[model samples]
Target: DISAKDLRNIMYDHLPGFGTAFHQLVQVICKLGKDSNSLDIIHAEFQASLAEGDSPQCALIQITKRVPIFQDAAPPVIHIRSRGDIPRACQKSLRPVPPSPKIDRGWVCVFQLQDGKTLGLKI
Candidate 1:
């Protein structure tokens, strides 16, 4: 019987520093029917999964995979790289950041669409 806020806190604490990304993740979970019994099971299992050393992304993928809506959907491809390694193609589309405050690590989640285009989310 965890409250929505409690679940949000778990994600926030586990994924520290990715505020907006974590919010979007919670929104997606809610859109998939947060009150459903399946969500309760997922909530319980997610904590255990993390305790057992799963990464936040790994736990989320496991939960999403079990959801009927996403069962047939391809899992997102995760790319972890130093900011300098980001492809020029992606960098051209990204907003320019201040030169002084260099980013050390960056993560990107890419999803392939049915039409063949890819959507990338930087988290």
Candidate 2:
């Protein structure tokens, strides 16, 4: 099994600024393993794959294939709103109304209201 110190070092080296996202990813991955040691194996394999010229993104995909924990994982939600204390709404009567683009996962948007209040939505 990998020691906590070693795991920490590896995480920082490969996943800088991981923050809460890494925590959540670990939790999901751990649930698929029979015990903590399984995570150590996965981590080791992931590192080796990276060393073998796999991009980090591809490494994650390969891990998912072997682990199966991420098969049904939901995409991250996104929230969208105005930037500052301004209530701006698109005009309905505008000619050729612009098409609303699909928002990708792992993004968030917040709107600041005129009274310095904030509103957010998960999309």
Candidate 3:
């Protein structure tokens, strides 16, 4: 089976300056599938640009992790066991990032949420 990692890289690499509004795209897609009952997409390998060293003024487009990173404040996820409901579950589960400085160091953390079931962390 094609993994989410593969799909993520393909999408992320196909964009300019490694630029893409991925979360927005995902949200739209999820909305499109709301009436269809379920969605199954991998969340991985998205690209981002961050400051270098100790400065918050640098910009570089880099693929940092293997999955979609969620907020630290995410509530415990409710279990969904049916394929027919996965898409709608994902749409409902989607959480938005809090407004804040975009280039902060805390934004560079290394853990990602993959397919809503797996958590990938950098060692």
Candidate 4:
């Protein structure tokens, strides 16, 4: 259960169906405005049908969960249109971090913060 803001930024890219869903999400949240803090956009596994507050947050969060948007990648995608398209959608988006092997060093990547005096995995 990601926040509307997070879900939106993630949408501003490759994925298809979810992009549209998040777009509508922004729509509702805009109207929901100040009601969002209690909205609880996270916790997608829970059922909203028994919700007591009757908020848009409940319905939308549930709607999002109803979609088979599994977490398997950086920018998650889904198959809202085709029954067979599910795997294809995710595959296109989840690329492996193509081989990078040179580790074995407890020594940091040499990254430093302000004052150039900050890093050290060995520290």
Model 3, poorest ten-residue lDDT window? Answer: 55-64
- What overall lDDT, based on C-alpha atoms, would model 1 receive against the true structure? 0.50
Give the Cα RMSD of candidate 4.
Answer: 18.1
TM-score of each: 0.50, 0.40, 0.21, 0.22
- Ordering by lDDT: 1, 2, 4, 3
Listed per model in order, the count of residue pairs whose N, CA or C atoms clash below 3 Å is 0, 1, 1, 0
For each candidate, what is the lDDT? 0.50, 0.42, 0.29, 0.32
What residue pairs clash in candidate 1, if any at all? none
lDDT of 4 by residue, 69-119 (tens): 311211212223332322332233322222331112111112233443322
Candidate 1 Cα deviation (angstroms), residue 32:
1.9
What is the TM-score of candidate 3? 0.21
Error of 2 at 13 (Å): 2.4
Off by over 4 Å in 2: 3-5, 20-23, 30-37, 68-123
Q: Pick the candidate with the highest TM-score.
A: 1
Q: How many residue-pair clashes does candidate 2 contain?
A: 1
Give the worst 10-residue stretch by lDDT in candidate 1: 98-107
Query: Which residue pairs come into collision in candidate 3?
Result: 39-87
- In model 2, the clashing pairs are 79-109
- Comparing 3 with 4 on TM-score, the higher-scoring candidate is 4
Error of 3 at 111 (Å): 17
